[PDB]
Each structure stands twice: as C-alpha cells, then as structure tokens.
Amino acid sequence: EVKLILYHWTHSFSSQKVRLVIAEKALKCEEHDVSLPLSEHNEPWFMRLNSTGEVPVLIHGENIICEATQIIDYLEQTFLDERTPRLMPDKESMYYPRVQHYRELLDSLPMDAYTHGCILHPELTVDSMIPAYATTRIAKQKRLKSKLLDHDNVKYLKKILDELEKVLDQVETELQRRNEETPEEGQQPWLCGESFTLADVSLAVTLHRLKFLGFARRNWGNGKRPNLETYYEHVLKRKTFNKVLGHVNNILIS
Amino acid sequence: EVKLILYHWTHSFSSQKVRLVIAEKALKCEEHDVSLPLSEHNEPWFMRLNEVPVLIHGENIICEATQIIDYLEQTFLDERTPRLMPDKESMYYPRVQHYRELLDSLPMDAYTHGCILHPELTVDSMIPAYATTRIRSQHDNVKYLKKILDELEKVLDQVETELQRRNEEQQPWLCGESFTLADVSLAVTLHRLKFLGFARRNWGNGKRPNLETYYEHVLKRKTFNKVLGHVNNILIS
C-alpha cells in the first residue's frame, strides 16, 4: 500500500549496498538518483568521488531512515511477507552469529578513506579505474607543513591497507571452509553458507569498489587469495548484482 | 531549478524548528508531512511524540534538524534571503551559537515522556489524561525527572537574564534585534513546554516575566503563526 522511496547517489558505496538489498528482496522501490551527470565544475561522477554520495534516505509510509546500515536494517525487519527473501538468518539460527560477525567486520572498513587514498596517493594502487587526471586535481615553511601532512596521510593509508588485508585473510579462510564443505558438482555457496546474506552484499560491494580503486591486485589474483578471487567472479555473474551494479564501475556511463 | 524537498513529521519538535527556519528565510519548499492521523494502534499524534526530518536539495541529502538548518544557512546566500546567524567572525556570533547550543541540549524527549508518565508535575497539560493511563500500563519513569526539570530551570534562568539585558538595552529578540537560530530554538522549546504543561511552573504570574513577554511576542509573529499556529491543537491531525 505505502510506497518505498529512495533518494541516493547511484555511484556512492552506500547507495550500492542499499539498492542491491532492495533487488535481493524483490521489493518495489521508487528510486531517485539525485546525482547530476555534470557538476557546477563540469566534473563527471568519477572525478567527484571525494565529493561523495554519502547518505541515502529511505521513506516508507511515515518512516524516514537515513544511512545505509540503518536502511538495510529497516528493510530486513519490515518486509516479512513469505514471498520476501530474507538476507539474514533467524536470530536463533546457529548461522546467525557467523553472518552478523562478517557483516559488522566488513561494514567496519573505512571505504571513504580508501577512496581518498586512491586519489591522493595513486602510487599505492595498481590498475586503478579512476583516470590519472583526477589525482592531479616562508615558502619552505608551508612547503614543510604539506610535506608533513603527506607523510602523515601515507602512514594512515598504509596502516588501513594492512588492516584490510587482515580482514580479507579472515574472509579467505572462511571461503576455504565453504570450498572444503562443498562438492565441485554442487552449487557454489556464498560467504556464510548456501544463501546470499547481508554479509555477502557488504563483501560483494566492497570487493567491486576495491577493484574500481585499484586495491584489488594487491589483495587477490595471481595466486593470492584464490577463494576470494573465485568469490568475486561468482558475484559478478549473479543476476541481481549485474542488474543493479553491472555498470557502476564503468566510467564511460554517466 | 533545484527543488527544495522536505520530508518530516508535522508535530515533531525537530521538524518544527526546520519548517520555521524555512519560513523565516522565505525559501520555497515542497513539504511532505509523512505522519498518519492514526497509528496501527489507533493512537493520534500526541501519543507518538517519542523524529528525523530530511531535506533533498538538488544533489544534497541532509538528515536531522540541526544539519538541515546549518545547510540552509550556508547555502541560500542570495542577498534577499534573511540570515539567521550573524557572521562567523562577528562578535555576536559566539553569543547566539552559545544559546542555540544551550537550548538544543535540552532533553525534550525526556520531558514529554515525563509529562505523560507523571502528570502530577504538569499544570494545564494539553495532552488528554487518558494518555497517562495507557502509557503507564506499558524510557525512564523515575523521580530523576524532577532533577531534569530543575536543570531546565537553570537554562531558563540563563535565558531570563539574557532577556533582562535586552530590554534594558520594536522589541528585541534573545540575541539582539533580529530573529536568529537561537530564537528558533527558544520559541519552539517554549511552545512545546506549554503543550506539555510545564509553562506555568517556569513562567507567568510574576515568574520569569521577560520570558513570558518573549513567548507572547513569538505567538504574534506572522511566520511563527503561519507555520506553527496549530501544532499544539489536538483537534487537528
């Protein structure tokens, strides 16, 4: 009866998680991309990534919910019709702690800082999908001030990239357990078991954004984290992921 | 042609502050009250007071009252548009910001629950008595409420003296001659206190007479009356 209304920036990381959850739950939503093809400074979305989409908002009848995690929690709790896929196991399920654990672990990642780091310090990326010209966009004194900021911001970026690796280690091990427990003839499982969950939305969208930023090759591929690599390949083939997010890394598409 | 869009609950304290700023700044806004006259439990708005408005303006999405209001002040700088804050370097800025922050720190949520839970502490509450009997069958139903009311007295103490300076020095407002964001915070605060039955305990009959005079001036202001004239009326959904 009451309409679902979503205001969002299509390319923002948060909007991607929200819109994928909506698609995975088969919900009808009136979605408003408020982002402009070209800004006041005639920039396209991939030159404005630090400007950032930030905060989507859902309106559902009399409820107003801002921010990705809060919106996703509202959706999972509100749409309980039996036709509606659930992205979370029942709170009494023996699988619930595992799913909740990886959901919070992935949602704790500082994605905004990775993106800012990508643009400010592209020498730490490999095959970033953002053009190099987005990066380009008393004298000893201020010189020294900015030298120090640069030193400080690189130590921060390096610290959180190491933390990302430790998180992706736990994920790789978890996916090894799924690999071990699944026959090569069976349908491939997701992160926490056979059903696609909220932890999968977070992991999937995180990996796709790491790819975009150029922090994929340091973290999987070429023999590194092969289960994670296979997972990402599985993600890209998922019909829902492709329908919702198939073009979001494509800078040719406004 | 950027549209200004507001989703809000009319009777929500935070929405009232936002909508009054919009009118004081003469901004055109597409306002959507999402509240329903009756809940699933057939409660009316005055039973559901325990919200988060959101502005959409072109590409910007702003949640919560204070952020929406700061966004409005920073963005609509056309010279025709009244300003509600003086200037970040002006010497009047720190005074306004201080009272804005002081008022905005009040736990309105606690007072409204307390009004309903412990109506013996109210005088002429506008909430029907049967709300007590329903809420009291089933956040903090404790005597601590009197301490939050005493703390309120101290904030209203501070306001009364600030008003005392203004008249000694057209009627002034709290912080000088022009209507500011601190007046917004104060006017909506007083009006809600009136609604809850905590006006007579805090002003009137010789108590805090500058505050009484201030509240009466607020009620006559065209913008306030046009936007908030009915919000204390339980006959109106």
Residue numbers in the entry:
A (entry chain A): 23 to 159, 186 to 302
B (entry chain B): 23 to 72, 76 to 163, 199 to 229, 235 to 302
Please quote the authors directly:
GDAP1 has two GST-like domains, followed by a transmembrane helix, which anchors the protein into the MOM. Structural data have shown a covalently bound dimer interface in GDAP1, and while dimerisation is a common feature in catalytic GSTs, the GDAP1 dimer is formed differently, with a unique interface having a central disulphide bridge between Cys88 from each subunit. We carried out structural and biophysical analyses on several CMT-linked GDAP1 protein variants and describe new crystal structures of the autosomal recessive R120Q and the autosomal dominant A247V and R282H GDAP1 variants.
Arg282, studied here in the form of the CMT mutation R282H, is one of the most conserved residues in the GDAP1/GDAP1L1 subfamily. Its strong hydrogen bonding to the carbonyl groups in the ⍺6-⍺7 loop indicates a central role in GDAP1 structure. This Arg-Trp-(⍺6-⍺7) unit is likely important for the stable folding of GDAP1. Arg282 in GDAP1 interacts directly with the backbone of the ⍺6-⍺7 loop, and a similar interaction is observed in GST. This is another example of an Arg–loop backbone interaction in GDAP1 that is both conserved and relevant for human disease mutations. Ab initio modelling, here carried out on the R282H mutant, which was measured at the highest concentration, supported the presence of a dimeric GDAP1, corresponding to the conformation of the dimer we previously showed to fit the solution SAXS data for wild-type GDAP1.
